[PDB]
Amino acid sequence: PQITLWQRPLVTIKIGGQLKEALLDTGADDTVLEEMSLPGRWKPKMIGGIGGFIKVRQYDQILIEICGHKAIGTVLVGPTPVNIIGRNLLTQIGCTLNF
Amino acid sequence: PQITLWQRPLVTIKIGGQLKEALLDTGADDTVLEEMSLPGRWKPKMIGGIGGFIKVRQYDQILIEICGHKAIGTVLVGPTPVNIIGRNLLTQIGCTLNF
Numbered sequence: 001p002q003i004t005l006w007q008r009p010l011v012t013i014k015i016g017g018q019l020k021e022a023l024l025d026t027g028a029d030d031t032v033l034e035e036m037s038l039p040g041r042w043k044p045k046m047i048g049g050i051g052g053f054i055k056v057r058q059y060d061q062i063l064i065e066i067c068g069h070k071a072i073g074t075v076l077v078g079p080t081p082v083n084i085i086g087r088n089l090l091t092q093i094g095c096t097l098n099f
Numbered sequence: 100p101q102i103t104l105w106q107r108p109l110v111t112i113k114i115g116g117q118l119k120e121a122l123l124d125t126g127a128d129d130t131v132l133e134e135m136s137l138p139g140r141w142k143p144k145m146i147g148g149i150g151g152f153i154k155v156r157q158y159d160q161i162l163i164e165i166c167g168h169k170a171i172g173t174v175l176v177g178p179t180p181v182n183i184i185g186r187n188l189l190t191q192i193g194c195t196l197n198f
């Protein structure tokens with residue numbers, strides 16, 4: 001796809017067999033999803049946002065599909081304003097910025 | 100240009116006679132810069148995300164040069180940890196997401 005930015009770049013993802021809406025956010029280093037259940041063990045992670053640093057749960061090697069493109073990578077789970085697909089998975093699906 | 104997301108998409112901008120480094124951020128609705136002086140009227144606003152909200156000053160119809168591209172729009176000013184170019188100005192330089 002070519003996605004313009006006149007509206008928020010909201011796309012459908014699939015994780016855990018479920019469809020969700022998520023934002024493609026080139027300013028996010030990481031992928032951060034709203035509270036959900038994921039398999040396996042998690043590790044602690046601190047992330048810095050606009051308002052401060054917060055604790056999230058880090059899950060590694062998770063299957064996730066983004067606009068139909070398959071990815072397997074790290075997913076953080078915590079109190080985020082919206083599901084965010086950040087650069088760790090945008091790089092996997094081959095996303096670039098162009099102007 | 101075609102900008103990779105292996106690293107943060109950092110570029111040089113010029114605003115108010117100052118050269119600054121800023122993040123091209125598709126998850127930000129509006130542009131947010133670190134504390135600086137700008138001309139004209141402003142109004143307060145709150146913006147938020149992980150970690151909570153911050154108060155910013157909203158200036159409209161500001162000129163910014165981004166990679167040689169001149170773009171006019173709203174700039175929010177406040178205690179952001181990084182200078183952010185948001186969608187409101189990315190559209191003006193014809194920036195898209197591509198995968």
Ligand SMILES: NC(=O)c1ccc(S(=O)(=O)N(Cc2ccc(C(F)(F)F)cc2)[C@H]2CNC[C@@H]2N(Cc2ccc(C(F)(F)F)cc2)S(=O)(=O)c2ccc(C(N)=O)cc2)cc1
Nearest residue numbers: 027028029030048049050081126127128129146148149181
């Ligand atoms: N309403 C607006 O005009 C607006 C709202 C929020 C922001 S933002 O400043 O929160 N922002 C830019 C930003 C902030 C901080 C960083 C830092 F990592 F360097 F600290 C980098 C970039 C947001 C857009 N890109 C990321 C950042 N966050 C996500 C976010 C917030 C609010 C919205 C919403 F839809 F509600 F408006 C969407 C997206 S963040 O701050 O929550 C964040 C999240 C994850 C990570 C990470 N490491 O993966 C980092 C930061 C900008 C404009």
Ligand SMILES: [Cl-]
Nearest residue numbers: 073074088089
């Ligand atoms: Cl990853």
Ligand SMILES: [Cl-]
Nearest residue numbers: 004005190193
């Ligand atoms: Cl366009």
